[PDB]
C-alpha cells in the first residue's frame, strides 16, 4: 500500500538496488576482456582463456530481476496515486480532465516503457555479447602449435563460427508507443531500429573479424599470427567498447528511475 520511496535506502530495502545489475554487467565486461587468443612467446605456446560463459549468465537475469523490481515499485506508486480518497462520482481517468494526476500517470507509463525497453535491449546485447565470447573460446580449438616456429589456423572453420553468430544475432522489440527516433539516436551506430520497433545489432565488427581469417589449413610464422592476433583482438576490443557504452547509458537509465520514484512519491505526498 504505502509505496514509500524517498531515499536510495527505501529503494534497496525493496530490492531496487541498481548497483547489482551494473556490478554483474561490469563482471561480464571483465570476463569478455579476460578472453585471450593463444599466443607463442620466446618459442613457446600459450593457451588462451576460454570464456567463462557463466559470468554473462549472472548479468542478464539480474538485469531481468531489476526491471521486475523497478516495475513493481512503479506499480505500487501508481496504485497509491490513482484514487486514495473518494468523494462521490469520479472514477477519474482520461474522461473528465483538469487534474494534474493525469500528467503523472503518463510520466509513469513512460517509466514503464523505459524500464522494459532498456531491459529488452540490454537483454539482447548481453546475448550477442555472450555469443561473441562463446566464439572467442570455440575458435581456439582451431589454432595450435605446428613447428617450433609456426602456428596452424583453420580460419575457414572459424569463419563458420563467426557467421553462425551473425545469422542468429539477438532480435529486440521496443514497447508499443516508443519514439524510435529517440532510440536510434541514443543507442547509436552499434544497433539499428526498424519502424516496427525491431531492434537489431550491427554485425559490422563481426564481419571484419570474419573477413580477416585465412583458409582452413593455413600455417603461419609467428610474425604473421601476431599481426592477425593484434588485428583480431583490436576489433574484439571494439565490440567491448560498444557494449560498455550501452551499459553506461543503461546505468544512467537506472539512475533516472531512482530520481523518478522519488519525485513521484513526494508528489503523491503533496496531493495526499
From Swiss-Prot:
Keywords from the named record: Coiled coil, Secreted, Virulence
Coiled-coil zones: 98-142, 221-270
Pfam families reported for this sequence: T3SS_TC
Compartments, record wording: Secreted
Broad class of the protein's primary localization: secreted
Source species, domain of life: Bacteria
GO cellular component, one term: extracellular region
Gene3D superfamilies (alphabetical): IpaD-like (1.20.1710.10)
Miscellaneous comment in the UniProt entry for this protein: Human meliodoisis patients have detectable antibody response to BipD. However, BipD does not act as a protective antigen.
Function: Required for invasion of epithelial cells, as well as for survival within host cells, escape from endocytic vesicles and subsequent actin-tail formation. Probably regulates the secretion of effectors BipB and BipC and their final integration into the target cell membrane.
Domain remark text: The N-terminal domain is an intra-molecular chaperone that prevents premature oligomerization of the residues on the coiled-coil region that are involved in interactions with the needle and/or itself. The residues in the C-terminal domain probably form oligomeric structures at the tip of the needle that are responsible for the regulation of secretion of other effectors.
Family membership noted in the UniProt record: Belongs to the invasin protein D family.
Protein name in the entry: Translocator protein BipD
Classification lineage: Bacteria, Pseudomonadati, Pseudomonadota, Betaproteobacteria, Burkholderiales
Encoding gene, per UniProt annotation: bipD
Amino acid at each position: 500500500a504505502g509505496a514509500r520511496a524517498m531515499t536510495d535506502d527505501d529503494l534497496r530495502a525493496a530490492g531496487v538496488d541498481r548497483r547489482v545489475p551494473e556490478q554483474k554487467l561490469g563482471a561480464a565486461i571483465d570476463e569478455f576482456a579476460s578472453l585471450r587468443l593463444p599466443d607463442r612467446i620466446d618459442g613457446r605456446f600459450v593457451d588462451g582463456r576460454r570464456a567463462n560463459l557463466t559470468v554473462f549468465d549472472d548479468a542478464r537475469v539480474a538485469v531481468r530481476g531489476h526491471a521486475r523490481a523497478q516495475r513493481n515499485l512503479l506499480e505500487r506508486l501508481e496504485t497509491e496515486l490513482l484514487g486514495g480518497t473518494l468523494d462521490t462520482a469520479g472514477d477519474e481517468g482520461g474522461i473528465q480532465p483538469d487534474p494534474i494526476l493525469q500528467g503523472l500517470v503518463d510520466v509513469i507509463g513512460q517509466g514503464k516503457s523505459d524500464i522494459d525497453a532498456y531491459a529488452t535491449i540490454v537483454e539482447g546485447l548481453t546475448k550477442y555479447f555472450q555469443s561473441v565470447a562463446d566464439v572467442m573460446s570455440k575458435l581456439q580449438d582451431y589454432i595450435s602449435a605446428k613447428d617450433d616456429k609456426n602456428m596452424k589456423i583453420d580460419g575457414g572453420k572459424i569463419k563458420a563460427l563467426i557467421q553462425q553468430v551473425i545469422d542468429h544475432l539477438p532480435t529486440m522489440q521496443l514497447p508499443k508507443g516508443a519514439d524510435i527516433a529517440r532510440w536510434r539516436k541514443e543507442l547509436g551506430d552499434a544497433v539499428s531500429i526498424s519502424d516496427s520497433g525491431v531492434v537489431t545489432i550491427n554485425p559490422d565488427k563481426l564481419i571484419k573479424m570474419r573477413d580477416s581469417l585465412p583458409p582452413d589449413g593455413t600455417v603461419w610464422d609467428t610474425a604473421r599470427y601476431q599481426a592477425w592476433n593484434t588485428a583480431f583482438s583490436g576489433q574484439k576490443d571494439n565490440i567491448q567498447n560498444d557494449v560498455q557504452t550501452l551499459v553506461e547509458k543503461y546505468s544512467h537509465q537506472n539512475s533516472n528511475f531512482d530520481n523518478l520514484v522519488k519525485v513521484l512519491s513526494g508528489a503523491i505526498s503533496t496531493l495526499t
